[PDB]
Each structure stands twice: as structure tokens, then as C-alpha cells.
Amino acid sequence: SASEQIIKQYQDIFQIDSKWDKPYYSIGLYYSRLLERKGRFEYRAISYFLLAFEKNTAKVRENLPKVITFWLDIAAASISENRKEMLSKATEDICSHVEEALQHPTYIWYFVLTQLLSRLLAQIIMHILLSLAVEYPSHILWYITALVNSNSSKRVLHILEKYRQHSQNPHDLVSSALLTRVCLQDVKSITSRSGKSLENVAPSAMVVPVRKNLDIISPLESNSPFRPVVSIIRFGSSYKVFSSLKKPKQLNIIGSDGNIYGIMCKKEDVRQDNQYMQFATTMDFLLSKDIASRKRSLGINIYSVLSLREDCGILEMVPNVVTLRSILSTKYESLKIKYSLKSLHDRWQHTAVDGKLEFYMEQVDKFPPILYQWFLENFPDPINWFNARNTYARSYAVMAMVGHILGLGDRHCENILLDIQTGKVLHVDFDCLFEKGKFRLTPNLLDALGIIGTEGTFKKSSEVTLALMRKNEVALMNVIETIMYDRNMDHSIQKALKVLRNKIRGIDPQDGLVLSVAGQTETLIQEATSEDNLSKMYIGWLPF
């Protein structure tokens, strides 16, 4: 009921300029929530939030969607053109954008502008768009090459904008000269590296090296000087070796620059980087914030990805890791009794409905769990052994929980990660929602932890995750969900709008009420653990 005297308050004490500086968010921050609850007055939305970041330069989430809130709105107006007025303002409201970039610094885009291309992958509103992008590129010399490493891959092999992206390389040598082209040789070499990946010593067909910038996922650190966006890293020389290209289009290379690193740029889905960047945003968000998160050093781990072709793309790499049937089968196949291969699908194809589904598996269970030994007999003395088991589960739920949070893929063998000499976790591919058939725990895993199965760490860890989740509320809900706006698949789900923010507050699964935040683990852990569902899930997942 203050809706008129809401605003009138703001205008009052702005006399003090920043002072607390907190207000300059709250102008539009509320005014975003104003229309959100339900656009002439919308021209004050970004016009408010612009001057704030100039002053504060903190909380990268406020300007994360403030782009889409701003730019999106303007584009909408243009398209519509009520509509007339909208468009008129959009050419008047968004006028405060570039005019601020002069006043307002050059690094503000790198984190946000990562999704500037990554949303669509247009001409109506793109006018003022790239004028800031590549300009800052020139200004950010260190990242110019990184952005070049980012940008030059699209034109190195998407056509109409590709030339427009090549025209960005055209405007570049015009703007950047107001080196790169020498580094641009890597772009054609990239596609050639992708061509050698497509099709060591002569087959390699790549010499010289001595390139510009590969930092293996530059951080772009904030708060905590701020000039460190690219930090100190660089790279030079590389030699041969091989990937084996073990799956289909994949490519995995060593990098000989400094120490020994391996950066595997593997041809796969281009937008796979979303959760690769998304979880990379929260992992850095969760990490520092508050105490209960920070005290246990949560956040799991991530690694870079970039776009090259509609196939080639890019990915970083994780050293010293073994997974799936190599490790797992090894232990008990020492006793043999290992190999069901494609009999289990067969044998389970021989039954359906409710008849055997818990049973052939409870025979497959007769391969007893050895997993606990793998941590144990591997690196002895407990001070390692102990500290690992902690870091194991401490790094298992904090992520696997986020799985049903986004509802993404059933983890099986190949897509699950466990590092050696220590323990961690990582998660990839795109198995968004649904399922066809019938977070994956089994006979070994649960018991393979401290004889208590799931009690000590699983409970109090996963909860701290679910603490900050609902707490920051729309914050992480605002940004990374553009990943949903990118790919629409398997018919169309715009229902994912609401079930999006409701599973944050956890109301939907049992239709009655929000469940106690401790229970929201309980009901969701007691579910996905199950007994019947777990025993009768698609067999292709090596269930027990």
C-alpha cells in the first residue's frame, strides 16, 4: 500500500550521492520486483541500476540480468513497434547505457558478456551492442587475446553473423590499431587441429606454437588488485603426443608451455559450457559467502569450455582421474564373477512390469561391495585416508544435490568424476530433465563410506548447500537460467519457468507445503535412495 510512497522515499535522501550507496540498487531492485509480481514506466529500470555499478562495482549478479532487463526490454519495444512509446523510450532509456560506459570498469563485461553471445547461439537492437564489446576488448589487451581465443574460433569455421564476427575481426584491426592476426593463425590452426581431430610426428601437421594466451579458465576475480582479471598466466610451446580420440569427435592434447598441462579441446555440444559456466558461477558464489559454507570449504570443482565450431568447441581438463568399469570392475574382477556384459540388458529384457525388477539385481548384488577398499588400500596411513573420505563426501553431495536442483542427468559411470590421490567431483553433458524408463547411489557407494552409509557428512553438508540456495532466492535464480532460454528441446517446456523457482523454495514435489529445509534433504534423499525405484531403474546404468 506504499506503492506511491515507496518511490517518493527514494528521491528524498539521494541528496547524499552514494553515502551508503545501497539505495542505487534499491531504486530499480524493487522496481524490478514491482512489475515482476504481475511498460511505459519501465524506462526507469536500468536507468536506475546503471549509476550504481559505476559507484559500487560489486555484486556481479545485479548487472548479470540487468542487461537482459535493460537490453531485452529495449529489443522487445523495438519488435513491438503502447508499442510506439515503448520503442521511443528504448531509444531513450537505453541511451544511458553507452553514455555510462564512458563514465563507468572495462572488465565489467567479461563475466556478463560471456553470455552476450551465448544467449542467441540481434540486428534490431545490436546497434549499440558490440560497440562496447570489442572496444573493451582493445582496452583489455590481456583479455583481447583471450576474447580472440574466444572469438576467432567462430570465424575459423554459423555464416551470416560469422562474417559479421569476421567483420568484428575486421573492425578489430581497425579498432585494435586505432600480434592478434599473428595469433589469429591459431584460429585456422584450431580448425586444423579440429581437422586433425576430424580425420604426432607428421600427422600432427602443426609447428611454431609460441602463442598468446591460454590461462585454463581465467578467473576474473572480484571484491576480495581488481586488475587481476587475467592474472599472471600465459603459454608458449607444445609438442605432438596424441589424444587417442577415445570416443567420437573428441580431441585431448598435452600442453608443453609451463610445467606440464593438458588442455583437451573436444568436439561436442557448443552450449554445454552453460552448466560448465553456470556451476562455475555458483561454485565461486557459494565458496566465499557467509561462514557455514566457507567453514567446510565446499564448492566442488569446474573447468573451462569455449566455442570453436558447431562441433569443435573447447574444454579444459582434469589431471589424474579414473572412473567407470576400469577401477570399479578391477577390484572384484580380481575374483572374476565380473562380466555380465550385455547379458544383463538381455536377462533384464527377459522380464518386465513388476516381476523380476528387484530380483535379478539382487542377484547382481551378489557381487559384494568392495569400494571402501579403493580409498583404503590405495593411499595408506589414515591422515591421508581419513582426510580423503571427508573430502570425498564433502565434495560429493555438495554437487550431487545440485543435480536434482536442476534435475539434470542420471549419473551412471562415464559421466561421474572421482579424482585420485584425493577426492572431488565434477559433472558434465546435457541430460536435462525427463527420463525414459523405470543422483545415483548403489550397494558399494553408500556403504563404501565409514560404515555409517549416509549420516554424518551427507546430512549436515547437503543442508548447508540448501541453506544458501533458498536464501539468496532470486539471485542465482536470475542469471544462470538463461541456459534454459538457449536450448529448447523435446517439445517445449515453458512450465520450467515456475518449477524453476519453486524447487528453490521446495514447494512443488509434495504439493501441500514448503518442507522444512532439513526435511527437504530428507524427503529428497529418502526418495532418490528408494528401494524399488533404485532397483528397477533403467538397467543401462549398471544398477548394483
From Swiss-Prot:
Residues 513-544 form the FATC domain. Residues 235-529 form the PI3K/PI4K catalytic domain. Residues 427-442 are annotated as: Activation loop. Residues 407-415 are annotated as: Catalytic loop. It is found in: Nucleus. Residues 241-247 are annotated as: G-loop. Residues 326-544 are annotated as: Binding to the RPA complex. Changing residue 429 to E: Impairs kinase activity. Serine/threonine protein kinase which activates checkpoint signaling upon genotoxic stresses such as ionizing radiation (IR), ultraviolet light (UV), or DNA replication stalling, thereby acting as a DNA damage sensor. Recognizes the substrate consensus sequence [ST]-Q. Recruited in complex with protein LCD1 by the single-strand-binding protein complex RPA to DNA lesions in order to initiate the DNA repair by homologous recombination, after the MRX-complex and TEL1 are displaced. Phosphorylates LCD1 and RPA2, a subunit of RPA, involved in DNA replication, repair and recombination. Belongs to the PI3/PI4-kinase family. ATM subfamily. Interacts with LCD1, which is required for localization MEC1 to the RPA complex. Interacts directly with the RPA subunits RFA1 and RFA2. This is Serine/threonine-protein kinase MEC1. It comes from Saccharomyces cerevisiae (strain ATCC 204508 / S288c).
